[PDB]
Amino acid sequence: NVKAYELRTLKKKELLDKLDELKKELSGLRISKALGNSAKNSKIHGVRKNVARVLTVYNQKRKMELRQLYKNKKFKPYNLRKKLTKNKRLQLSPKQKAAMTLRQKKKVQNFPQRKYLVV
Amino acid sequence: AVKLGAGYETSAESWGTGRAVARIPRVPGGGTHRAGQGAFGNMCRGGGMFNPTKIWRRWGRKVNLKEKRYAVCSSIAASGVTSLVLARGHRISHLKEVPLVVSNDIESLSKTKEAVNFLVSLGLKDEVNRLVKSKKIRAGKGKMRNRKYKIRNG
Amino acid sequence: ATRFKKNRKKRGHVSAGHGRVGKHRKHPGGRGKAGGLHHMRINFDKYHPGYFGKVGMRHLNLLKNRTYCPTIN
Amino acid sequence: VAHNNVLPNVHLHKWWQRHVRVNFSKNIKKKKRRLLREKRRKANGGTPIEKLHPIVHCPTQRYNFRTRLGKGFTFEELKGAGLTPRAAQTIGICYDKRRKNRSEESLTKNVERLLKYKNSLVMIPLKKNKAKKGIGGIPADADKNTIKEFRNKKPLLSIFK
Amino acid sequence: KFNKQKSSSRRKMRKAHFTAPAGLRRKIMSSKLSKELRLKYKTRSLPVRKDDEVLICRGHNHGREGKVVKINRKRYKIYVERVTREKVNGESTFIGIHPSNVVLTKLKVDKNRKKILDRKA
RNA sequence: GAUGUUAGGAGGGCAAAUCCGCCGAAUUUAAGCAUAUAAUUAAGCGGAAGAAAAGAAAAUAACUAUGAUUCCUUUAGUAACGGCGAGUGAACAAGGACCAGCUCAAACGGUUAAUCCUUCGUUUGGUGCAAACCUUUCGACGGAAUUGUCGUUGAAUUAUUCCAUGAAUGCCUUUAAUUUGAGCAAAGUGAGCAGGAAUGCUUCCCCAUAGAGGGUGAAAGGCCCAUAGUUCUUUUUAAUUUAUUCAUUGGAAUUUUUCAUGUCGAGUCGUGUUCUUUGAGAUUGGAGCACUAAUACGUGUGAUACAUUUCACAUAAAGCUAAAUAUAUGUAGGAGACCGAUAGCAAACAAGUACCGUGAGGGAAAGAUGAAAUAGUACUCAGGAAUGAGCAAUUAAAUAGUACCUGAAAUCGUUAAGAUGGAACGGAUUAAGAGAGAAAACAAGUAAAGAGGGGAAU
RNA sequence: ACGGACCAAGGAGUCUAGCAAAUGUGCAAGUGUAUAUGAUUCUUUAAACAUUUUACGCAUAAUUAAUG
RNA sequence: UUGUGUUGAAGCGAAAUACGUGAGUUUUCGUGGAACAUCUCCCUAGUGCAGAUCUUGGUGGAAGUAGCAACUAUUCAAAUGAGAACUUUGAAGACUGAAGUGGAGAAGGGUUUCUUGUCAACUGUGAUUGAACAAGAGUUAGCCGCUCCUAAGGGAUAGCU
RNA sequence: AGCACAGUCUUAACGAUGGAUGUCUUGGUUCCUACAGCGAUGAAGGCCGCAGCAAAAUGCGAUACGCAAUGAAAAUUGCAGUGACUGAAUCAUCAGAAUGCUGAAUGUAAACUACACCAAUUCCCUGGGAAUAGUGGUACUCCUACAGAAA
């Protein structure tokens, strides 16, 4: 049983090697289960979860190092770029919605709404 | 109100003359218990009530403002006499006068302990006891409708 | 006040006060003002004499604000 | 029909249950509207949320004698108050380009109402102790001391009614 | 009572009680503290842990006391070492006691309990 | 125009309660029925939003006049439409909610497209642990565009007064509100009775800004969660705090002095005719076809078709726009004089499930042991076994044994009593039997002795 | 003549609009405060409370196709 | 408003020297094991059943009755088993009579196939049998088919409505 | 040890059948309030899978009744088994990672796990070293820019 923080410092090589040997041990456990042997059947869950953990760490490392590759560059692949709602993606930018012509810009600047009181 | 189409959400058919059965509508099909059973109709099981309750019942009422003011004035006057307050149900046999008034510092006390002490010292110990011991779980289906207890008015 | 309704006091009387011979059918004379001039004519003539026909000219759009005038004696 | 009754007239020959609606939420809506306008006047920082409207004579012979709040002052009365429409709409003055002053009485009375509102105005500087003389007929900005002493005073809403 | 965001419906909150998750069940499985222990930690109630000495003061076993042996949040019960009972078959099993019927007399030391007791300050 | 697996993008489907277009009945009413009504509805097709649509007068009025749209009260079941039958049925004014105005076209700018986009670079500072995000103006390139982007809303001229502008230095405090997530949160587990078990009953104490609810072996303010209250934390948003020196760059409003009365939406309006729609009637809107305008002194409304003509009001044939408004949908909250398992949704449950139909579709029944099965029946006997029985056994209780709360009637069994010649039951009156019964169906008081309970008297 | 083998449970003049009569109640040539607003009311409260000395309905006057 | 409940509420069965004229009301015993009433006055309604070839559910007499009738036909002995007319074995008598209850396939079915157990229900009599129930297992392709071709024809593209 | 005729009907007591009644209620119903689009970045819907023993429902997607992270934080259990003396057992939150075949379904098809064409593709170390028949792309319409052909 391996936790997710200590293997966070491994390189991809031994991460994949750990995954491979762990899968091999899981395969051996399944072979034993298929045979008459049943003592080890309860370690299948733990080994399966270890496989899930190491896969999670490896995939997160790969995704982060891929994002570092498309840092800025304005043309990230679709999965790398934002995944908002489709209509949110197609919405006009706040700048575009707030854009105004020079005529109304100078009108607003010269005669803004004013704060005041009464007697 | 009941759900608008309740009991009428089935296919209508009353093939019933010559079938030696009542002319009530029957649900169609087969292979299930419901097939051929009596469909909508107040007499039929699962058939919808006779006059489904509607939300546009006259819930509220309009009361003349003059009549409401008359009623409030009369209620104050009635509270002003001893016999009526006694007959209403309150235990005021130890009150000095029925239209009892207390100094404005009653508006300033802030502890229920001293409020109860003041109420007792006025002679309403019996009234307080009645209110306290009257707490009781009510009868009927009301108590499963967030209406558990029933208290008297002090 | 559904407990004051007259139907409650005919609760075990079979016909519900609507007659044993004539029964309570649904619209046995027609719907609404159906039979005027034909079989409700006596009712119409006895209680609403000048009902049928038309007299006078048409005021196309009235605008009662024009002719509104209250009177004090 | 039978007996001596008015002839029936009920216009319920269509599917009316679809169109029936009952206002269970009249007072709830009242409370919500009051809360919304209270929050508005709390947010705009002491400036009243009402806008000044002229008083006008109701049309037709039926309501000849009665006056009521109209929509917006006209160009003539704004000019008589010395106030361009563009600048007036930024200090809570309603303006409409459709009304015309057909009578000197209406002109003078709306002008004097405008002047009363104007002199009751106390302007808040646009830039936090950068008081200036105003533009387009807007009064000059008040100073820090008078703003301080007037903000705690009850704002009169009589001129709005 | 005075805030309308929280329901007072019997149906609603008894459904909440009977379908509460385990984490919430831990909180509603609390119980009183003895007088001296209450004065020592200046708090009134505490959720029960596995190894606390407890004293049951309600029910058929209202007199004796013992150390809790296990807690069943699914059944809303706790078990104490010497309150066993004989089944019909012939083996012993602990008697389920609702935590509301017991008072804590001594509670075990754990890093979390002192952090929450200091939080109680 | 083609064509391009050239580069970058978009549409498609689901979902509908509210919303926007089209298409479009009949049942029904008229006591028949054909116009009419149902209904500009249902069904059908298409299209959006958190609202939609409408909306800034080719409006109303006729007055002392109003001033975009929407919605509420009302006008008003009114004017009007209609085998003038059945039926149908607005608008203006008035009182309110809300309140917001704008831009293209056309005009003017040619000592100069002053515009726009793509791609590639540069920095101006900032909140993030990170991921990412907000600001930033200097470009260069390639294009689009004069078959028209951008600026002005006539153009200059004085006077004031405003608005954006950069650099340097300092200042970033307080409070109220609003809104998340967290904590803290009073007082009995005191006698006694009866209990399997108090939260019950008596009795003695209390807390309450908490006596809402839920749980706990029976009805709990003081056993637990929570509740009243309060303290932190999150969102934004008001008032408050401080701004000071130097500079030129452009713009705006009004006010002086002159020009020129400019522009103003065409197969469109309009008219005829046909169909539909409307309350709209010698035609309310729309549509098809035919004809087909004027140029602001015009042309369009002013609810009866015309001709001549006054008057008033608007300025069509281009466009955007928040609020007040609606929500039988979805999700999440909160409630109720609602239903309480043949009820309430079809579905309290493994319910749109089982099952039926080739298919479109149709569509159920079914909740409850006990406080605790961490008490689900051990042991013995008899039986092949199912089961049964017990001197045996859990429980307070098993006639609470899993179909398990209670356990009606129909129907059936056991025992007892009675009746019994082709009905049975019954009404009225008694008699004989058999069950039950003392509250009127007798005996207050009196004296003694035994057990008790009270009240008054110091 | 038709329905009824038996038992249990369910089972049918109601709701809304509009008019009138009757009766009770309030006020009375007036009556109803509509929509809406305010207000230390906001568990209850979606109810209660209130309305700066020409809103609207009905009534206070009828009659006529109608100018009136 | 003012009451009843673990010293037993509601409900239910039988009743009562009970009251009423009557719908009913009130009590007793038994059962029941957790709530119930308010007739002090009033408010409210999905408020009162003998019927509707009423609806749903349950249950009767008919009645141990009609009936368990096509396919010529069974018998002896043994085994298993608690139990054998209809399970198995041997013997006999017969049938189907290659237009076959014989072998292969298609459509349709979908594990009914096999082995080992097994009998609560089903197998309209029995049943130890079984297509039932339970646990496991079983389907091997370059050559058999699909896959390819085109037919009656279907869908779609371009247009055009 | 003996005695009742049988049947039919009536009554009572006790039981069978049945599931009414009463009492329950994590359900419904109605109203009020608040927010409100999902999809070629592959939706809704449908299949197929996934647990040690695992059918349904619920949950999930080859990391498959759950991974990571964050808050709480000692249990979780039918057995087996796993957990500290708190990134560990279990809840809650859920932003990271992952998300089978389909489906508007979009390479051609479809009662096919059938058939294309173009890049071979993917991974490990800091240019090498491996492993893979595996992986991506290719619909129709349209917009902007571009390309070389046309009159």
Short mmCIF file of C-alpha atoms (C1' of nucleotides) in Angstrom, two decimals, chain I:
data_model
loop_
_atom_site.label_atom_id
_atom_site.label_comp_id
_atom_site.label_asym_id
_atom_site.label_seq_id
_atom_site.Cartn_x
_atom_site.Cartn_y
_atom_site.Cartn_z
"C1'" A I 1 -65.88 -48.13 31.62
"C1'" G I 2 -70.37 -46.16 29.53
"C1'" C I 3 -74.04 -42.43 27.00
"C1'" A I 4 -75.45 -39.44 22.91
"C1'" C I 5 -79.31 -40.96 15.66
"C1'" A I 6 -77.43 -38.38 11.35
"C1'" G I 7 -78.29 -34.09 8.56
"C1'" U I 8 -80.37 -28.82 8.37
"C1'" C I 9 -81.03 -24.20 11.07
"C1'" U I 10 -80.30 -20.67 15.47
"C1'" U I 11 -77.38 -18.84 19.65
"C1'" A I 12 -72.76 -18.26 22.65
"C1'" A I 13 -67.47 -19.16 23.67
"C1'" C I 14 -62.90 -20.26 21.45
"C1'" G I 15 -60.33 -20.66 17.00
"C1'" A I 16 -59.25 -20.79 11.11
"C1'" U I 17 -59.53 -17.73 6.56
"C1'" G I 18 -59.27 -12.65 5.38
"C1'" G I 19 -56.96 -8.02 5.83
"C1'" A I 20 -61.06 -3.97 7.40
"C1'" U I 21 -60.46 -0.60 11.51
"C1'" G I 22 -57.27 2.37 14.70
"C1'" U I 23 -52.47 4.24 15.29
"C1'" C I 24 -48.18 5.05 12.64
"C1'" U I 25 -45.21 7.64 7.79
"C1'" U I 26 -37.41 9.01 5.35
"C1'" G I 27 -43.89 9.56 0.56
"C1'" G I 28 -47.12 12.66 -2.18
"C1'" U I 29 -49.74 17.31 -3.15
"C1'" U I 30 -50.20 22.66 -3.27
"C1'" C I 31 -48.24 27.41 -2.45
"C1'" C I 32 -44.09 30.82 -1.68
"C1'" U I 33 -38.91 31.97 -2.58
"C1'" A I 34 -34.05 31.80 -5.50
"C1'" C I 35 -31.49 30.54 -9.60
"C1'" A I 36 -31.21 28.47 -14.57
"C1'" G I 37 -29.03 25.96 -20.85
"C1'" C I 38 -26.38 21.56 -22.11
"C1'" G I 39 -23.74 20.18 -26.89
"C1'" A I 40 -18.34 18.86 -32.39
"C1'" U I 41 -13.71 20.92 -25.79
"C1'" G I 42 -18.78 15.54 -28.36
"C1'" A I 43 -24.74 16.75 -24.97
"C1'" A I 44 -29.40 14.32 -23.48
"C1'" G I 45 -30.46 9.31 -24.42
"C1'" G I 46 -28.89 4.08 -25.27
"C1'" C I 47 -25.60 -0.02 -24.77
"C1'" C I 48 -21.33 -2.54 -22.46
"C1'" G I 49 -18.67 -3.06 -18.39
"C1'" C I 50 -16.56 -2.27 -13.05
"C1'" A I 51 -16.50 -5.06 -6.27
"C1'" G I 52 -12.60 -10.85 -3.09
"C1'" C I 53 -17.06 -13.47 -2.53
"C1'" A I 54 -21.90 -9.03 -6.27
"C1'" A I 55 -28.28 -10.51 -9.25
"C1'" A I 56 -31.25 -5.69 -8.88
"C1'" A I 57 -31.20 -0.62 -7.42
"C1'" U I 58 -27.50 3.16 -6.35
"C1'" G I 59 -22.47 4.69 -7.75
"C1'" C I 60 -18.70 4.63 -11.12
"C1'" G I 61 -15.65 4.18 -16.37
"C1'" A I 62 -10.09 -0.13 -18.11
"C1'" U I 63 -7.43 4.63 -12.42
"C1'" A I 64 -14.39 1.69 -13.15
"C1'" C I 65 -19.48 0.77 -5.78
"C1'" G I 66 -13.92 4.51 -6.79
"C1'" C I 67 -8.08 7.95 -7.74
"C1'" A I 68 -5.94 12.70 -6.28
"C1'" A I 69 -6.61 17.10 -3.41
"C1'" U I 70 -9.22 19.86 0.76
"C1'" G I 71 -12.22 19.75 5.72
"C1'" A I 72 -13.57 16.39 9.44
"C1'" A I 73 -11.17 12.62 11.17
"C1'" A I 74 -11.13 6.72 14.01
"C1'" A I 75 -13.46 3.27 12.45
"C1'" U I 76 -14.90 0.05 8.59
"C1'" U I 77 -17.14 -5.14 8.70
"C1'" G I 78 -21.67 -10.87 6.77
"C1'" C I 79 -16.85 -13.30 6.23
"C1'" A I 80 -12.28 -12.20 4.43
"C1'" G I 81 -9.54 -7.87 4.89
"C1'" U I 82 -7.78 -2.57 5.60
"C1'" G I 83 -6.72 1.28 9.29
"C1'" A I 84 -3.23 6.20 13.96
"C1'" C I 85 -1.67 6.27 18.64
"C1'" U I 86 -2.99 11.45 11.16
"C1'" G I 87 -2.53 12.81 2.83
"C1'" A I 88 -3.85 6.15 5.90
"C1'" A I 89 -10.51 3.51 8.05
"C1'" U I 90 -14.83 6.14 7.02
"C1'" C I 91 -17.68 10.53 5.88
"C1'" A I 92 -18.13 15.34 3.61
"C1'" U I 93 -16.41 18.73 -0.14
"C1'" C I 94 -14.77 18.25 -4.93
"C1'" A I 95 -11.67 22.67 -8.33
"C1'" G I 96 -6.83 18.13 -10.32
"C1'" A I 97 -6.50 13.52 -13.15
"C1'" A I 98 -9.28 10.03 -15.75
"C1'" U I 99 -13.87 9.64 -18.19
"C1'" G I 100 -15.25 2.26 -22.57
"C1'" C I 101 -18.82 1.65 -27.39
"C1'" U I 102 -22.35 4.76 -29.17
"C1'" G I 103 -25.45 8.68 -29.90
"C1'" A I 104 -26.28 15.62 -33.46
"C1'" A I 105 -22.45 11.29 -34.64
"C1'" U I 106 -19.54 13.68 -38.38
"C1'" G I 107 -14.36 8.65 -43.10
"C1'" U I 108 -17.84 4.54 -45.69
"C1'" A I 109 -21.51 1.19 -43.36
"C1'" A I 110 -24.71 -1.34 -39.97
"C1'" A I 111 -29.87 -7.39 -37.54
"C1'" C I 112 -21.87 -6.59 -39.82
"C1'" U I 113 -17.89 -5.47 -33.32
"C1'" A I 114 -17.48 -5.15 -41.73
"C1'" C I 115 -14.29 -1.82 -45.04
"C1'" A I 116 -11.38 2.55 -46.54
"C1'" C I 117 -7.42 6.54 -47.41
"C1'" C I 118 -3.52 9.98 -45.15
"C1'" A I 119 0.39 10.58 -41.35
"C1'" A I 120 3.34 5.02 -38.99
"C1'" U I 121 2.44 5.81 -33.80
"C1'" U I 122 3.52 5.86 -28.63
"C1'" C I 123 6.73 5.89 -24.61
"C1'" C I 124 11.66 6.40 -21.63
"C1'" C I 125 16.50 9.27 -20.59
"C1'" U I 126 18.85 14.25 -21.69
"C1'" G I 127 20.64 13.30 -29.33
"C1'" G I 128 20.09 8.22 -28.15
"C1'" G I 129 16.79 3.59 -26.26
"C1'" A I 130 12.68 0.75 -26.52
"C1'" A I 131 7.61 -0.93 -27.51
"C1'" U I 132 3.75 -1.16 -30.53
"C1'" A I 133 -1.41 -3.12 -36.58
"C1'" G I 134 -1.44 0.25 -31.82
"C1'" U I 135 -2.60 6.06 -32.29
"C1'" G I 136 -4.58 10.47 -34.46
"C1'" G I 137 -6.98 12.73 -38.92
"C1'" U I 138 -10.62 12.44 -43.10
"C1'" A I 139 -19.01 14.38 -43.09
"C1'" C I 140 -22.20 18.34 -44.86
"C1'" U I 141 -23.21 23.57 -45.07
"C1'" C I 142 -21.15 28.29 -44.16
"C1'" C I 143 -17.71 32.62 -42.69
"C1'" U I 144 -12.70 35.13 -42.74
"C1'" A I 145 -7.79 34.75 -44.81
"C1'" C I 146 -4.67 32.12 -48.28
"C1'" A I 147 -3.22 29.11 -52.85
"C1'" G I 148 -2.43 28.13 -57.68
"C1'" A I 149 -5.50 27.17 -62.14
"C1'" A I 150 -9.95 30.34 -65.43
"C1'" A I 151 -11.72 35.53 -69.37
#
